[PDB]
Design a protein around this ligand. Structure first.
Ligand SMILES: Nc1ncnc2c1ncn2[C@@H]1O[C@H](COP(=O)(O)OP(=O)(O)O)[C@@H](O)[C@H]1O
Ligand SMILES: Nc1ncnc2c1ncn2[C@@H]1O[C@H](COP(=O)(O)OP(=O)(O)O)[C@@H](O)[C@H]1O
Ligand SMILES: [Mg+2]
Ligand SMILES: [Mg+2]
Lengths: 470, 474, 470
C-alpha cells in the first residue's frame, strides 16, 4: 500500500512526497479525492501525472486540471499505471475528454469496462508489414493524384469554408462502408464552440456512430492538451490490434500538440531549444507518430491538420512534422468558388506515394498526363483572358476544352453532400477513375458539354447526364 | 496552522512562514488590513501577492487566514458605477449595495451547454456589420493602430447597445486613470453609463489587481448571462494583464518562457476567453460576447501575446494607418480581417446583399494596379473599377455616427443592384445622406418590413423607391 | 536605532538591524563616518531601503558612490523617506536629488517645510478632464500634434535627432508667457547641457520663477532613479497648496527606467524581456500617474523619451506610449535630409486634432497635409525606377507639392542659431494654417523647392525666392 502527500503547489505543477520504498513510476496517474472537512476548505477531484523523480522520495507532477484549492499535506493516491482509457465498442458514438470520461450527457462507462494505458512503446521492428499498400478511398481526385498509404501520415492543408469537415466525414463514411474500419477523431486545443458545432454536425451525419471522438479544449491546462492525442491514438490502436482492421485517425492541429509540449517544458523548467521550443521536440513528435503504422493484422492511417506558425515552413514545428508525412492534400477557395467540390489540389503526395510502385506502371502514366494538362491550362489562364479568348480558340482550345473537362471530372458527388442537394452520392474505384481519365485524355468524350462532367461519379454517369440535358 | 509570521517583503510580494492549512488561491490578511493572495505553497514558506500598498509590512509581523477563495460582488446595483477589480466603488456616489457574490474562477460552460451563435451584434459600422459580422456568443479581436481610431470602435459598439436589450462591462487594464475617466464621462453623456457598469485597474495600481481585472469583469458578466441576459465585455488591453502576471511570476521565481513569460500564459488567456459562450436553451438562452482590443506600434502582430490571442479568438478586425491617412475611415482592411461565425451572424436582408459587395471589393483590390492605365482597359475591367471605387466610397463613415441595420442594408442593396453606378464617385457620400432623409420621409413601409421580418422588402417596391429618389437627386 | 554594514556590491548595500526595529521600505538611512586613522576616508552617504531579507537585514540603494565603505560602519535610520523643501524657497534655485542646493547661493534654513518624495497618486474623483489647446509657435506641432493645456506631451526619438533642441525651444517659446511656475528635471543626460540651460534662463530672467533639479549621467543609479521624484514633489506643492498652473519639463525620462534596470540584478530579480526589470510597467506607472492635473491645479508635462535604436517596440517606449495625451516622433531620415525639427508628421496621431476644436478650419488642412505625405511615401519606392517617368504626369503633381509641404514643415529655431547661422522665428497657428492652405491650392507651385527650407511665414518663402532670383 502506498499513498503520498502534497508538499508544493506552484501553478499547474504539484510536488508529492511518498514513503521511501513506494515511489510511483514516471508516467503513473495520481488521484486526489478530498471532501471539504469544514467551511474553510473546498472539494477537489484532481488528476496528476508523474513527470520527474527529484530525490528525497518526492516526485514532480503535472496537473490535468485546475489546482486551485489544494492544501499542503493533502493525501494523494497512486493508481499504479498511466492514464488508462476505455477501449472497444463502447467508445463508438461517444465523446471523451483526456481522462476517458465521457463529456457527452449519454451516461458513463461501467466500471468493469476494459481500459488501456495511454503510454506504450511502439510496435517492434518484426511486427511491421513488409510492403506498401494503397488505401482506396473512393474519391477520384485523391485516389488518382495523392493516394493514401496504409499506415501513412497525410497532411491536410486548406483555408476556411473550403470543405475540410465535409471531406473528413466523407472519408469516415467511405472507409466504414467499403472496408469496414472504425475511426477516432482527436481535436487537440479545440475551441469549445467549434467542438459543440462538430459534435452536432457529425451526430446528424450518423457517422457519429462510427466516430468515437476525444476533445482537449483550448481552456484546459498544458498536460491535458499534450495527452489528448495519445488517448485518441490508444482508442484507435485497440481496433487495429484486437479487431484486426484498418482504422482512420484524425488530429485537428498537431501544432497545438507541439505548443502544449513547449508550455509543459517551460513549466518543468527545462532549457529552451532553438526558436524557444522544448529540447525534446523531435522525440515527442516521434513517439506520437511512430505508433501510427501498418502491422500484419491491420493499420492506422492519419489525416493531420498542420498550422505553419508564420507561413515559415522551415520553422521547427512544421519541419519536424513534415519529416513524417507520406502524403498531403491542399484545398482551394478558388475551386470552392468555381463550384468544384471537393476543392482539392494535392501535389507533393504524387511524388512519394503514387509514383514508384503500385501506380508506377499504369496509373502513374494516366496521373502524370492529368497533372501536365492542368499545369498547361494554368499558364494559359493568364493569356486566355484577353488575347487568348480568340488566339487560344483554335490551337489551345484543343488543350483547354479537354483540360476544363478534366477539371470538372475531378469533382464528385459526396454521400455527405446529400443534405445540401438531393444527390445520392457515389463510391468510385481506382481502376474506374484511371479508366475514365484515360478516355478523356484520348478524346472519346470531347463532343459532350463541359457541364455534363460536373459533380458525378463514374464516367458512364457523364454520358447519362449529357443524354438527359440533350 | 492558521497564522504565520512574515520572513521577507518587497516589490509587492511577501514570503510568510506558517499558514500550513492555507490553500492555493486563498485570500489572506496582514496585521494592517492589507489583503494578499496565496499563490505559491512551497516546502517551508508561502509566497503571497499583496493587493494594496505593501510599505507598512515588516519582517516579523503576523499574517492570518480568511478561509476563502477570491470572490466578487454581483448584482443589478453595479450598473451605472465605477469599480475596482474588487467590488469597491471608485466614482464616489457612495456604496454599491450588492446582495451576493461570484467566484473569480468559475468554470466555463462545457461542450454540451452551448448552442451555435445565430443572432447578430450590431455595431453600427457599415464595414464591420457587412464584412466582418459579430454574433452574440462570439469572441472577436480588434487589432488597431494607434494613429487610427481603434478605441472608438469599442466605445461606439457599446453606445449602439441602447435599444438592443444588452448589459455591458468596459474593463480598463493598465490604462491612464484620467483616460478611464474620459471614457466614463463619454459613456455618462450617452446614458450608456446607465447599462455599462465599468471596471478599472490603472497603471498606478498593484500588479495583482491588473492581473485580476478581466476575470472580475467576466465574473460580473456571467451573473447576467446565467440569469438569461445578453452581455458585451470589452477588454481594453490583455497584453498589460499578461505583463502584470509575468512580473508577479518572475518575482516569485518561476521558470521563464519565450519572452520571460511563464509556461501558463497561454492557459491564462484561454481560461479567460472561453467563458464567452452562447448558452443552449435548456440553460436559459443567455450569451456573453467578448471584444479584446490591442494597439499596435506599426502593424506588427508578431509579438507573443498577440499571437496567442489571435489563435484563441474567432476573428480579428484590422485597422491600418496607411488606409487611415489615404482617406479611408474607419480604415478597416477587409482583406486581412476575418470572422469565422460570419453569415450565421447576419439577418436575412444583409446576408442577401453582402456577398456581391464582398465580390466587388475583392475584384477592385486585385485590379487596383490597372487603374492607372484606365484608357486602355476592356469594358469589363472598366466596369469593375467603376464599381470598386463606389463601393469604397459607400463603406466610408464618420466617427461616432452609427447607422441602423435596415438603412445599411438598403444602401448596400442600392449599390450592388446598379442604381448607384450613374453617380460620380464624389457624389456617393452625399447621395447616401440624402437617401437616408428620403427614406425617413417616405420609405417607412420598407423600413418597417425590414425591422419586422429581418428580410428584404418586395423588390419591385424597393426599385420604385430608389428610382423615385434618383428622380429628385441632382 | 543603529545598524551595521554587511555587504557592499557597487550601488547596493546590505545593512543589519539589531533590536527588531527594522526601517520600513523607502526609508532613508545615513552613514556619517569620520576617519579613525590614516587608513580610512570620511563618509557622508545616504541610502534608500528597498527590500527586507531574513535575519534582521535590509537591502538599500546608495544615492552616491560607495567607495570607502567598510564592513561594520554604523547606519542611522532617519525614520522617513527622502524629504525635500517645498514652496517659494525653491524658486530660482538649483538642487540635487536630496534637496541640497548645488548653486553657490547659500543653504536652505533647517526649519523650512520639507515634503517626502514618495506619495500615492490622485484618485479618480479628483482628475481634470478638459482639453484646451496650447500654442507653441512651431508649424508642424501646432498643425499636426497640438499640445493640451494640462496634458502629457512625449517627444520620442533615437540618439541625435533633436529632442533636447526641441525641449529648449519649447521652454524659450512658452515659459516666458506662462503665468505660473516652471520646473525642470535633468535625468541622466549632459551636465554641459544643464549648465547651458541654467545660464540661458538666468540671462532671460525666467529663472526667478523656475526650480531646477539635476541628476546627470555621472551619478550612480540611485540618484538617476530619484531625481525625477524630487522634481515632481516640488511641482506638486505648487499645484496643490498654491493652486498654480505648472509646467513640468523632464529631459529623457527613459534614464529613470534604465537606472532601475541597472540596479535590478544586484537587488536579486530575474530579468524580464530585453533584459529589463520585471517591475518596469509598475515602476513607471508609479511615477507617471502622479504627474496629472486635478480640480485644484494643473501640470502641463513635456517629456523627452529616448528610443534605444529607433526601435519603437522596445519595452520602455512601448510602455510610455500609454501615458501620453500627445506625442511627437522625430525621424532620422528627415534629420539626415537636413529637415529640422524632423518631426514625423503621421505618428503624432495629431491626437489633440481630435476633431472638434481644429475641426472646421484646421482639421481639413491637417488631414489634407497628412494624406499628401502618405501618398508620397508609397510613391518613393515606385518613384525610383518606374516612377519618375510614369508618375511624371499624374503623380508628379502630388510629388511636386509633397516636396514643398515637407520642406515648409521645417523651421528655424531661436535656440538653434549656433547650428543655422540665423535667428529664429515664431509662427502663429493662423499663419501656419493659411500658408499650408495656399501651398495645397497651388499658389506657390512656381517657386523653387529650396526657398521653402528653414523659414517661418510663407511671405518669407516668397522673399527668399526673390533673393534667389526668381
Ligand atoms: N461536397 C460538397 N458538396 C456540396 N457542398 C459542399 C460540399 N463540401 C462542402 N460544401 C459546402 O461548403 C461548406 C463547408 O463546410 P465545412 O466543411 O464545415 O467548412 P470547413 O472547410 O471550414 O471545415 C458546407 O457547409 C457546404 O455548404
Ligand atoms: N532645430 C534644429 N536646427 C538645426 N540643427 C538641429 C536642430 N535640432 C537638432 N539639430 C542638430 O542635431 C544635433 C543633436 O540634437 P540633440 O538636441 O542632441 O538631440 P537628442 O537630444 O535627441 O540627441 C544638434 O547638435 C544639432 O546639430
Ligand atoms: Mg472548417
Ligand atoms: Mg538630448
Amino acid at each position: 500500500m502506498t499513498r503520498g502527500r502534497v508538499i508544493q503547489v506552484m501553478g499547474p505543477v504539484v510536488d508529492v512526497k511518498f514513503e521511501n520504498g513506494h515511489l510511483p513510476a514516471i508516467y503513473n496517474a495520481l488521484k486526489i479525492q478530498h471532501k471539504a472537512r469544514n467551511e474553510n476548505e473546498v472539494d477537489i477531484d484532481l488528476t496528476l501525472e508523474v513527470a520527474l523523480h527529484l530525490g528525497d522520495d518526492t516526485v514532480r507532477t503535472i496537473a490535468m486540471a485546475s489546482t486551485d484549492g489544494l492544501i499542503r499535506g493533502m493525501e494523494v493516491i497512486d493508481t499504479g499505471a498511466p492514464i488508462s482509457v476505455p477501449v472497444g465498442e463502447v467508445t463508438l458514438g461517444r465523446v471523451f475528454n483526456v481522462l476517458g470520461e465521457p463529456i457527452d450527457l449519454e451516461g458513463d462507462i461501467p466500471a468493469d469496462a476494459r481500459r488501456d494505458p495511454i503510454h506504450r512503446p511502439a510496435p517492434k521492428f518484426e511486427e511491421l508489414a513488409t510492403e506498401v499498400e494503397i488505401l482506396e478511398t473512393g474519391i477520384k481526385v485523391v485516389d488518382l493524384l495523392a493516394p493514401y498509404i496504409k499506415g501513412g501520415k497525410i497532411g491536410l492543408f486548406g483555408g476556411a469554408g473550403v470543405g475540410k469537415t465535409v471531406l473528413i466525414q466523407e472519408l469516415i463514411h467511405n472507409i466504414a462502408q467499403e472496408h469496414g474500419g472504425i475511426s477516432v477523431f482527436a481535436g487537440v486545443g479545440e475551441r469549445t464552440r467549434e467542438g459543440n458545432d462538430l459534435y452536432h454536425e457529425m451526430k446528424d451525419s450518423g457517422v457519429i456512430s462510427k466516430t468515437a471522438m476525444v476533445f482537449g479544449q483550448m481552456n484546459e491546462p498544458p498536460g491535458a492538451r499534450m495527452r489528448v492525442a495519445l488517448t485518441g491514438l490508444t482508442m484507435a490502436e485497440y481496433f487495429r490490434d484486437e479487431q484486426g482492421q484498418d482504422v482512420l485517425l484524425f488530429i485537428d492541429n498537431i501544432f497545438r500538440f507541439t505548443q502544449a509540449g513547449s508550455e509543459v517544458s517551460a513549466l518543468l523548467g527545462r532549457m529552451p531549444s532553438a526558436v524557444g521550443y522544448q529540447p525534446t521536440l523531435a522525440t515527442e513528435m516521434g513517439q506520437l507518430q511512430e505508433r501510427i503504422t501498418s502491422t500484419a493484422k491491420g493499420s492506422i492511417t492519419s489525416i493531420q491538420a498542420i498550422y505553419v506558425p508564420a507561413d515559415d515552413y522551415t520553422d521547427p514545428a512544421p519541419a519536424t512534422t513534415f519529416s513524417h508525412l507520406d502524403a498531403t492534400t491542399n484545398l482551394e477557395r478558388k475551386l470552392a468558388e468555381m463550384g468544384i467540390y471537393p476543392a482539392v489540389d494535392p501535389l507533393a503526395s504524387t511524388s512519394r506515394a503514387l509514383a514508384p510502385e503500385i501506380v508506377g506502371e499504369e496509373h502513374y502514366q494516366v496521373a502524370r498526363k492529368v497533372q501536365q494538362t492542368l499545369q498547361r491550362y494554368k499558364e494559359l489562364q493568364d493569356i486566355i483572358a484577353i488575347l487568348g479568348m480568340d488566339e487560344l480558340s483554335d490551337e489551345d482550345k484543343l488543350v483547354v476544352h479537354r483540360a476544363r473537362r478534366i477539371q470538372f471530372f475531378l469533382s464528385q458527388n459526396f454521400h455527405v453532400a446529400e443534405q445540401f442537394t438531393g444527390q445520392p452520392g457515389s463510391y468510385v474505384p481506382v481502376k474506374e477513375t484511371v479508366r475514365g481519365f484515360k478516355e478523356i485524355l484520348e478524346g472519346k468524350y470531347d463532343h459532350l458539354p463541359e457541364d455534363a462532367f460536373r459533380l458525378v461519379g463514374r464516367i458512364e454517369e457523364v454520358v447519362e447526364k449529357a443524354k438527359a440535358m440533350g | 496552522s492558521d497564522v504565520g509570521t512574515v520572513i521577507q517583503v518587497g516589490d509587492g510580494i511577501a514570503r510568510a512562514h506558517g499558514l500550513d492549512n492555507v490553500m492555493s488561491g486563498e485570500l489572506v490578511e496582514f496585521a494592517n488590513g492589507v489583503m494578499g493572495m496565496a499563490l505559491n505553497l512551497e516546502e517551508n514558506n508561502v509566497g503571497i501577492v499583496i493587493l494594496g500598498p505593501y510599505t507598512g509590512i515588516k519582517e516579523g509581523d503576523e499574517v492570518r487566514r480568511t478561509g476563502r477563495i477570491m470572490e466578487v460582488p454581483v448584482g443589478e446595483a453595479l450598473i451605472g458605477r465605477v469599480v475596482n477589480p474588487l467590488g469597491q466603488p471608485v466614482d464616489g456616489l457612495g456604496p454599491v449595495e450588492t446582495t451576493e457574490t461570484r467566484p473569480i474562477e468559475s468554470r466555463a460552460p462545457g461542450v454540451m451547454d452551448r448552442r451555435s451563435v445565430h443572432e447578430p451584434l450590431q455595431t453600427g459600422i457599415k464595414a464591420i456589420d457587412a464584412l466582418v459580422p459579430i454574433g452574440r456568443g462570439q469572441r472577436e479581436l480588434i487589432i488597431g493602430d494607434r494613429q487610427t481610431g481603434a478605441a472608438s470602435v469599442a466605445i461606439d459598439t457599446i453606445i449602439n447597445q441602447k435599444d438592443q436589450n444588452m448589459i455591458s462591462i468596459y474593463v480598463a487594464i493598465g490604462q491612464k486613470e484620467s483616460t478611464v475617466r474620459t471614457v466614463v464621462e463619454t459613456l455618462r453623456k450617452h446614458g450608456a453609463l446607465d447599462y455599462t457598469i465599468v471596471v478599472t485597474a490603472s497603471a498606478s495600481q498593484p500588479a495583482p489587481l491588473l492581473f485580476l481585472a478581466p476575470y472580475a469583469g467576466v465574473a460580473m458578466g456571467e451573473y447576467f448571462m446565467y440569469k438569461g441576459k445578453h452581455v458585451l465585455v470589452v477588454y481594453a488591453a490583455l497584453s498589460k494583464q499578461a505583463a502584470a502576471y509575468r512580473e508577479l511570476s518572475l518575482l516569485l521565481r518561476r521558470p521563464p518562457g519565450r519572452e520571460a513569460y511563464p509556461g501558463d500564459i497561454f492557459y491564462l488567456h484561454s481560461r479567460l476567453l472561453e467563458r464567452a459562450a452562447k448558452l443552449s436553451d435548456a440553460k436559459g438562452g443567455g450569451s456573453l460576447t467578448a471584444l479584446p482590443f490591442v494597439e499596435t506600434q506599426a502593424g506588427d502582430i508578431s509579438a507573443y501575446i498577440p499571437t496567442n490571442v489571435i489563435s484563441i479568438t474567432d476573428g480579428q478586425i484590422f485597422l491600418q494607418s496607411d488606409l487611415f491617412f489615404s482617406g479611408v475611415r474607419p480604415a478597416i482592411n477587409a482583406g486581412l480581417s476575418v470572422s469565422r461565425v460570419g453569415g450565421a451572424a447576419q439577418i436575412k436582408a444583409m446576408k442577401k446583399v453582402a456577398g456581391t459587395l464582398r465580390l466587388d471589393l475583392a475584384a477592385y483590390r486585385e485590379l487596383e494596379a490597372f487603374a492607372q492605365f484606365g484608357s486602355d482597359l476592356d469594358k469589363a475591367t472598366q466596369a469593375k473599377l467603376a464599381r470598386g471605387a463606389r463601393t469604397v466610397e459607400v463603406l466610408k463613415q464618420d466617427l461616432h455616427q452609427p447607422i441602423p441595420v435596415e438603412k445599411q442594408v438598403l444602401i448596400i442593396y442600392a449599390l450592388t443592384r446598379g442604381f448607384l453606378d450613374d453617380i460620380p464617385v464624389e457624389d456617393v457620400r452625399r447621395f447616401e445622406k440624402e437617401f437616408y432623409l428620403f427614406l425617413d420621409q417616405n420609405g417607412q413601409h420598407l423600413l418597417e418590413h425590414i425591422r419586422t421580418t429581418k428580410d428584404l422588402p418586395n423588390e419591385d417596391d424597393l426599385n420604385k423607391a430608389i428610382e423615385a429618389f434618383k428622380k429628385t437627386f441632382v
